[PDB]
Amino acid sequence: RVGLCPGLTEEMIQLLRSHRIKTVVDLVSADLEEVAQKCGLSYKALVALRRVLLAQFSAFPVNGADLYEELKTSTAILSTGIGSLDKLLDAGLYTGEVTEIVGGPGSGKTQVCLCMAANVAHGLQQNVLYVDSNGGLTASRLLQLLQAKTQDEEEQAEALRRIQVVHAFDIFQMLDVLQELRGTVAQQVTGSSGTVKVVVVDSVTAVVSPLLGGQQREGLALMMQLARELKTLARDLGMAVVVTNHITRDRDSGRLKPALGRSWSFVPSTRILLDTIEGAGASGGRRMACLAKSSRQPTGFQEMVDIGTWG
Amino acid sequence: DLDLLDLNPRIIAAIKKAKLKSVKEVLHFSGPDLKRLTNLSSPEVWHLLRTASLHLRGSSILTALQLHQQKERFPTQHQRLSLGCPVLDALLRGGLPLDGITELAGRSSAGKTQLALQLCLAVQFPRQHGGLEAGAVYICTEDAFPHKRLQQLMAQQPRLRTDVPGELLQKLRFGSQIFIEHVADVDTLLECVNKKVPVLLSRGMARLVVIDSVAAPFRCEFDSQASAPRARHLQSLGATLRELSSAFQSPVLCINQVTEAMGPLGFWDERVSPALGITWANQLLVRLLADRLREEEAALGCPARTLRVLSAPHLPPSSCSYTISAEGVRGTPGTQS
Amino acid sequence: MQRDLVSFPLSPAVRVKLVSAGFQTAEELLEVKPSELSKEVGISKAEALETLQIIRREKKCTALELLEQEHTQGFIITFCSALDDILGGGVPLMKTTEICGAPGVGKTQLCMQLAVDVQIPECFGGVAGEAVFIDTEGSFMVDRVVDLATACIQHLQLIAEKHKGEEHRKALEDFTLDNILSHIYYFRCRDYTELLAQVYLLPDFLSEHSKVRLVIVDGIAFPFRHDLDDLSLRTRLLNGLAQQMISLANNHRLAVILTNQMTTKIDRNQALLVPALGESWGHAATIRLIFHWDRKQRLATLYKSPSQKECTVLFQIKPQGFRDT
Numbered sequence A: 001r002v003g004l005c006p007g008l009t010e011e012m013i014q015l016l017r018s019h020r021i022k023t024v025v026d027l028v029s030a031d032l033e034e035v036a037q038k039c040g041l042s043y044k045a046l047v048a049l050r051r052v053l054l055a056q057f058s059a060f061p062v063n064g065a066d067l068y069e070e071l072k073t074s075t076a077i078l079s080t081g082i083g084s085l086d087k088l089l090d091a092g093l094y095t096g097e098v099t100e101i102v103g104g105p106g107s108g109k110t111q112v113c114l115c116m117a118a119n120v121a122h123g124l125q126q127n128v129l130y131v132d133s134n135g136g137l138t139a140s141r142l143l144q145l146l147q148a149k150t151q152d153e154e155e156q157a158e159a160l161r162r163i164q165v166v167h168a169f170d171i172f173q174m175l176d177v178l179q180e181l182r183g184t185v186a187q188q189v190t191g192s193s194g195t196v197k198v199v200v201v202d203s204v205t206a207v208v209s210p211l212l213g214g215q216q217r218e219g220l221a222l223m224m225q226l227a228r229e230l231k232t233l234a235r236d237l238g239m240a241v242v243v244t245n246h247i248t249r250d251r252d253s254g255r256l257k258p259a260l261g262r263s264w265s266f267v268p269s270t271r272i273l274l275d276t277i278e279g280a281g282a283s284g285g286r287r288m289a290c291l292a293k294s295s296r297q298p299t300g301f302q303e304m305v306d307i308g309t310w311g
Numbered sequence B: 001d002l003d004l005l006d007l008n009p010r011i012i013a014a015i016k017k018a019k020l021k022s023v024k025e026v027l028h029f030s031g032p033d034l035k036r037l038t039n040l041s042s043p044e045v046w047h048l049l050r051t052a053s054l055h056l057r058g059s060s061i062l063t064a065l066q067l068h069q070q071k072e073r074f075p076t077q078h079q080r081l082s083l084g085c086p087v088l089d090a091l092l093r094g095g096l097p098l099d100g101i102t103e104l105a106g107r108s109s110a111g112k113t114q115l116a117l118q119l120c121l122a123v124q125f126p127r128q129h130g131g132l133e134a135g136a137v138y139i140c141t142e143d144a145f146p147h148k149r150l151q152q153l154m155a156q157q158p159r160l161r162t163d164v165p166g167e168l169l170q171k172l173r174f175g176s177q178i179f180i181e182h183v184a185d186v187d188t189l190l191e192c193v194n195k196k197v198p199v200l201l202s203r204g205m206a207r208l209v210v211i212d213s214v215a216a217p218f219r220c221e222f223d224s225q226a227s228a229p230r231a232r233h234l235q236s237l238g239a240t241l242r243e244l245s246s247a248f249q250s251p252v253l254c255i256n257q258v259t260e261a262m263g264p265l266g267f268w269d270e271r272v273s274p275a276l277g278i279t280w281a282n283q284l285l286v287r288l289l290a291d292r293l294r295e296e297e298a299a300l301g302c303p304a305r306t307l308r309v310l311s312a313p314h315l316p317p318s319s320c321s322y323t324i325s326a327e328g329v330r331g332t333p334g335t336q337s
Numbered sequence C: 001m002q003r004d005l006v007s008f009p010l011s012p013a014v015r016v017k018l019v020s021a022g023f024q025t026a027e028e029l030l031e032v033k034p035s036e037l038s039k040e041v042g043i044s045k046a047e048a049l050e051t052l053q054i055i056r057r058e059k060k061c062t063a064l065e066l067l068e069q070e071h072t073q074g075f076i077i078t079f080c081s082a083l084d085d086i087l088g089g090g091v092p093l094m095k096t097t098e099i100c101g102a103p104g105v106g107k108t109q110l111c112m113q114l115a116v117d118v119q120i121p122e123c124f125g126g127v128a129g130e131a132v133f134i135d136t137e138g139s140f141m142v143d144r145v146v147d148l149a150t151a152c153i154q155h156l157q158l159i160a161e162k163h164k165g166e167e168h169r170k171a172l173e174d175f176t177l178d179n180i181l182s183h184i185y186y187f188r189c190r191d192y193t194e195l196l197a198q199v200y201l202l203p204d205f206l207s208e209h210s211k212v213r214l215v216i217v218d219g220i221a222f223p224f225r226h227d228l229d230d231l232s233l234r235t236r237l238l239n240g241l242a243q244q245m246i247s248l249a250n251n252h253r254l255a256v257i258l259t260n261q262m263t264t265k266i267d268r269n270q271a272l273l274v275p276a277l278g279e280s281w282g283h284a285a286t287i288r289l290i291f292h293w294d295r296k297q298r299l300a301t302l303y304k305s306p307s308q309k310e311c312t313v314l315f316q317i318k319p320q321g322f323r324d325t
């Protein structure tokens, strides 16, 4: 098409369409000598055109030491504001990866996300974007959490002004919000005071459950697209993405497993499982934490958290 | 009935290709189901849901003021079926509601069958005398129908209903407007309710249903290890009865048995509780309890019977006392609590 | 910068036609004439117009503005001081609240009390709105509502007389029984298809009536617990309904009240009462309340909440309605 890359004219494009060449892959997956016999175009121009197209539309590798040095001063560790979870997570969670929190109703995923958002907004003074899909975000709880870390009203207001709230109730709204955030961050490369560092999706299950069922396959494609968006946001822009998920029990085995299926089981790079302590001894706040999946620690270690003491 | 709507020809062709018949058929499915069937996109599927939902009903605004004021347009909210006794009617604030299942539970010899017969007789009176000017349907499950007591009650009716003039009583054909059915199984009861009752109700030959002992087959066919099929059958039966009662504006009276209490259900200090569990209790509107105290009639000499209101959306929990004689069931004045 | 076609709500046929043609990114079709697009792809011009309209269809609020809005919007009082105290002030707007309990425990009384209370004038600390009641069981009796409204009117009159102001008298001039009864809109759904249809029609109704501040659906378990053997379809429908209700509550600044039923869970030869409709339904609501009898008193337990702490209080039902002590 005209304007896609230099050296392409509409006459050449139409002539190529005459001989069944339509897209970039079609032009690249061809032969120089074989194609330049049905119409007889310029011989050495085709290779230059294909080299240019490959230059624009192909990724390039990087030597190991270069990105080692780059990530040495780029990757950051953000504390969650809870000592036990920080010790379990090895001093916090790294940017550039996706973190998942699973658990049943009342487990405390929203509380953990709120504590993280407050700590990042106040302790580190960086922007946070909150995506809510089930109405679990309240400003009163955020104010209560902040009041336990500072007593200056102006400081609290400044911390609260650094948290952005977005409501998305179906999959398409969430995808649009994520794409808009990607575009905004891409346009906001030069700026450094205002760029979002942490993104929280309150519940990915609430927007994918209605699409799953029957003999169809659209829901799987949509959730894979959502996973691709989250991975791109986490890796390319060097951000920290935290999502929450529901818990399910296997009918044939009676084992607790994350929801959304085996295809979703491969998405997160780190998973944390919350639980109640056998009822007794967990009348409130006392919750059971575990490391269901990780890439830097052995799996199975357990810790202890108390929601009541965070406020 | 799908062609009465206003849709684009492509949408109509697609839904016809999907073998969709009626508006209920399309509202039965979900969004993803219609997406997989019609091979459409979300906006036009949403528009189809818009059109179907508007077709089922719409453009009508109903307020509580209209329900409270327009009495003739809404007989359900203002009309009650009398029990034949002023005291019992005062206890029930008019009588039985015209929409919803009413339970009557109690131990043996409490007097439930007498109340059922009295209601079957009283349903035939004119509007100003508490009746609905229609007959009744009686379904027997445990024993045979007591025709001798019914004959005695019909003979004694002019002496019980003192308010009604005798001339109007003389023209009432009591026995010809009561229908009797017999059931020996759960499946037989379900088939009877599904087939024979709606035919009688639609033609207008009856405006009252008496299932009588609903617990009799369930107590004998399902054990403690088959609770799920029993719950399924109970839910189906309750749904069918509620649908019929709502459609034809006719009360449904069910008679239940009790079991030893031996309290999540609010039956702490009571000896007996209604049977069939919570699944059956979830389907009811008004719950009553008839009781007899054999340890107090040993002192009084005469039987001591009380009727109690366990629960109702509009009635406080209260009770009264009644007696049974040759006329029928009659309440005792000045005993309501 | 690149947006894929899969993320847009298009029909599978036109999407697969575009994919087979060679279009991969959203911006690729932003510079193609609809006539030429129809010629190359093979779709009709109406399809091209529709997809071009759809593709060009996909603000900034901070926690401070959200806190200000939360403070400005009030709560709905239940005339039970303990319940209001443990709820944070009352039933919060823009949230979904669920009530569970055994038969004859007082869910419908709470629904009627909330429907009456949503209309209290702001001079007395109310919201001054209107209510929508959706009945799926036929348990809505007008006489009980009349009793509750009369009791509320008497209470407000006594408060105004004690205060001896001037604004209170003007506010109570228009707080009569007729207006209270006329500001409640009633719907009756006899099947789950009818319930879905009414819920679908709700947004336009709320657009027409902008003063509504409460939506009550008295009974969601009954339509879904009979003559429905395909449980996957039931779960899909329930999830869709929950998403629609939370979207409605957030968009129209309402309070959504749902009533559930209780079932029996049999384990270790022991019977416990649990809310019905499965485990995945527990995530649907935002706040969950459970009513039960202890010995003869009625208890309300804040089973789940994202802002408060689990507690338990005492209430009772009077001839005047939902009360305390």
Ligand SMILES: Nc1ncnc2c1ncn2[C@@H]1O[C@H](COP(=O)(O)OP(=O)(O)OP(=O)(O)O)[C@@H](O)[C@H]1O
Binding pocket: A103, A104, A105, A106, A107, A108, A109, A110, A111, A112, A134, A136, A284, A285, A307, A308, A311, C282, C283, C284, C285, C303, C304, C305, C306, C307, C308, C309, C310
């Ligand atoms: N201020 C508070 N003080 C103490 N505990 C609190 C406070 N606020 C909330 N909680 C606790 O939070 C619990 C619920 O946690 P949370 O809202 O994070 O659940 P969740 O896992 O997100 O649930 P859902 O699946 O329903 O969205 C409650 O059981 C309550 O005990």
Ligand SMILES: Nc1ncnc2c1ncn2[C@@H]1O[C@H](COP(=O)(O)OP(=O)(O)OP(=O)(O)O)[C@@H](O)[C@H]1O
Binding pocket: B106, B107, B108, B109, B110, B111, B112, B113, B114, B115, B149, B324, B325, B326
């Ligand atoms: N002609 C009559 N005169 C007076 N009392 C009578 C007469 N016929 C029956 N009774 C009374 O009816 C009582 C039993 O009533 P009924 O047959 O309605 O019981 P029920 O509650 O249906 O019991 P069950 O569980 O056995 O069906 C007896 O105690 C008896 O005193």
Ligand SMILES: Nc1ncnc2c1ncn2[C@@H]1O[C@H](COP(=O)(O)OP(=O)(O)O)[C@@H](O)[C@H]1O
Binding pocket: B310, B311, B312, B313, B314, B315, B316, B317, C101, C102, C103, C104, C105, C106, C107, C108, C109, C110, C317, C318, C319
């Ligand atoms: N007019 C009234 N006066 C006093 N108490 C009443 C009145 N109407 C109903 N009640 C009581 O309130 C309760 C209503 O419970 P209900 O709303 O039916 O709960 P559910 O809908 O969960 O069964 C009943 O137990 C009844 O005893």
Ligand SMILES: [Mg+2]
Binding pocket: A109, A110, A136, C306
């Ligand atoms: Mg939550």
Ligand SMILES: [Mg+2]
Binding pocket: B112, B113
């Ligand atoms: Mg009998």
Ligand SMILES: [Mg+2]
Binding pocket: C107, C108, C139
């Ligand atoms: Mg009710």
